[PDB]
Amino acid sequence: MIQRTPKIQVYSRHPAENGKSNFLNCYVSGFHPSDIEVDLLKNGERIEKVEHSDLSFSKDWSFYLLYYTEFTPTEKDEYACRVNHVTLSQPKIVKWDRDM
Amino acid sequence: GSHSMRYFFTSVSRPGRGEPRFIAVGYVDDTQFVRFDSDAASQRMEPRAPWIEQEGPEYWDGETRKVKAHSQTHRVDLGTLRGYYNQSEAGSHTVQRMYGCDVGSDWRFLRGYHQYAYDGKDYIALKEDLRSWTAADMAAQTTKHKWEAAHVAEQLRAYLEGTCVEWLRRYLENGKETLQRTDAPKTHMTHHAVSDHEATLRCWALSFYPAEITLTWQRDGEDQTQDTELVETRPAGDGTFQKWAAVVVPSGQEQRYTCHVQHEGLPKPLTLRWEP
Amino acid sequence: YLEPGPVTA
Numbered sequence: 001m002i003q004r005t006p007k008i009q010v011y012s013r014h015p016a017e018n019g020k021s022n023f024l025n026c027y028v029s030g031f032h033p034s035d036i037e038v039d040l041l042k043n044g045e046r047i048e049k050v051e052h053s054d055l056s057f058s059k060d061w062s063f064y065l066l067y068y069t070e071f072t073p074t075e076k077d078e079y080a081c082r083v084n085h086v087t088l089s090q091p092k093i094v095k096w097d098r099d100m
Numbered sequence: 101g102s103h104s105m106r107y108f109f110t111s112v113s114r115p116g117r118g119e120p121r122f123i124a125v126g127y128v129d130d131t132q133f134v135r136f137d138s139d140a141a142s143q144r145m146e147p148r149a150p151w152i153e154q155e156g157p158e159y160w161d162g163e164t165r166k167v168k169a170h171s172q173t174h175r176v177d178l179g180t181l182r183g184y185y186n187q188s189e190a191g192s193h194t195v196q197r198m199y200g201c202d203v204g205s206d207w208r209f210l211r212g213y214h215q216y217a218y219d220g221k222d223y224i225a226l227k228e229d230l231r232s233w234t235a236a237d238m239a240a241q242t243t244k245h246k247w248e249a250a251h252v253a254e255q256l257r258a259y260l261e262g263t264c265v266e267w268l269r270r271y272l273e274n275g276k277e278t279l280q281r282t283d284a285p286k287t288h289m290t291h292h293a294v295s296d297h298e299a300t301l302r303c304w305a306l307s308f309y310p311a312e313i314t315l316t317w318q319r320d321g322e323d324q325t326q327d328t329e330l331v332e333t334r335p336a337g338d339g340t341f342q343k344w345a346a347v348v349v350p351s352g353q354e355q356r357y358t359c360h361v362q363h364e365g366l367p368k369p370l371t372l373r374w375e376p
Numbered sequence: 377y378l379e380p381g382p383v384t385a
Contacts, residue, residue, distance in 0.1 A: 002220050002221060004220070007332065009332070009334050013336045013337045013338055015306075023337050025334075025337055027334045027335065029332065032194075032220040033192070033194055033219075033220065034110060053132075053335075054123060054125045054132065054135045054137065055110055055125075056108045056110075057108060057110065057198075059198075061196055061221070062220070063110075066335050099290075100302055100344075163378055166378035166379070166380060166381065167378055169380075169382065170378070170382055173381075173382040173385075174382075177384060177385040180384065199379065216385070223385075246383075246384075246385070255380075256379065259380070263377060263379075264379075266377075267377035
């Protein structure tokens with residue numbers, strides 16, 4: 001009853017290049033309890049087609065999941081991960097920052 | 101390299117109606133190979149690696165039977181533990197179980213483990229000798245006595261030392277093409293100018309397997325931990341992993357800093373330096 | 377290969 005907030009990374013499976021098919025990932029970890037809602041956003045709109053890994057957890061018992069969807073990046077499309085969990089009073093939104 | 105087989109079980113009670121949501125995943129090292137989800141339609145243990153599809157319908161039958169036995173133990177435990185903790189029926193609760201075995205480079209038994217948690221905290225765990233138990237509180241103490249009189253540790257010891265390692269070795273053989281392959285990290289460094297006097301160097305490691313890796317920075321050949329940021333290792337989604345480590349540096353002094361990468365797949369560590 | 381059958385707590 002320790003609740004733990006999720007850490008969130010947003011990134012691509014492969015090095016990101018315009019016009020090349022890829023996968024946009026949202027990796028959510030360190031959270032408890034397990035119920036969580038993760039949306040991947042494209043220019044602020046929910047992407048419908050999102051899959052996720054099978055729930056597992058770390059040695060400290062905190063959960064992690066990977067949400068992912070196929071995409072072809074372009075120069076002007078902005079992407080983001082939107083996460084809600086009991087520990088958060090509103091949705092947390094992390095932008096995909098390719099150029100790190 | 102050492103290897104490990106590990107199973108992870110989560111049950112989450114559903115107060116209004118019905119049995120708990122149950123999810124089970126099996127790993128060999130960092131590779132998911134099986135799953136069961138009480139919400140999926142098949143109601144069978146399902147393959148998640150190509151090399152486990154070699155196993156015959158008797159394996160699948162046996163794994164499905166066992167995994168539903170696990171689900172039923174957790175369903176019961178959620179009820180028992182609720183009562184032990186004097187909790188109402190209104191709240192969702194969670195039980196998590198993890199067990200498995202590690203073997204060394206010779207593939208001989210190294211370590212086994214079997215741990216259980218209620219609502220995200222330690223409940224009970226098998227000790228290292230696999231002969232007795234660590235109970236975190238008095239509820240768990242009651243469980244420990246039950247499992248002692250029922251010689252549970254002995255049955256688990258037989259499995260963790262015997263069967264677990266035996267099937268791990270089978271899996272390592274059958275999945276050898278991927279499971280006995282190490283993928284060294286693919287590295288590079290980027291540079292980002294914060295202000296006129298401050299720059300960030302990020303040392304990236306992509307596409308490595310297994311997940312275990314060390315990235316560290318040095319300045320003029322000694323370790324540097326201040327002004328560094330190291331993200332959690334993360335799955336690429338294609339079975340490999342990614343990580344990076346960043347250091348902030350005074351603009352112009354980039355050349356003093358070196359990122360060092362260690363990994364099972366790199367015969368010696370690798371050093372990266374900005375130039376680039 | 378799963379263990380045969382967890383014992384209830």
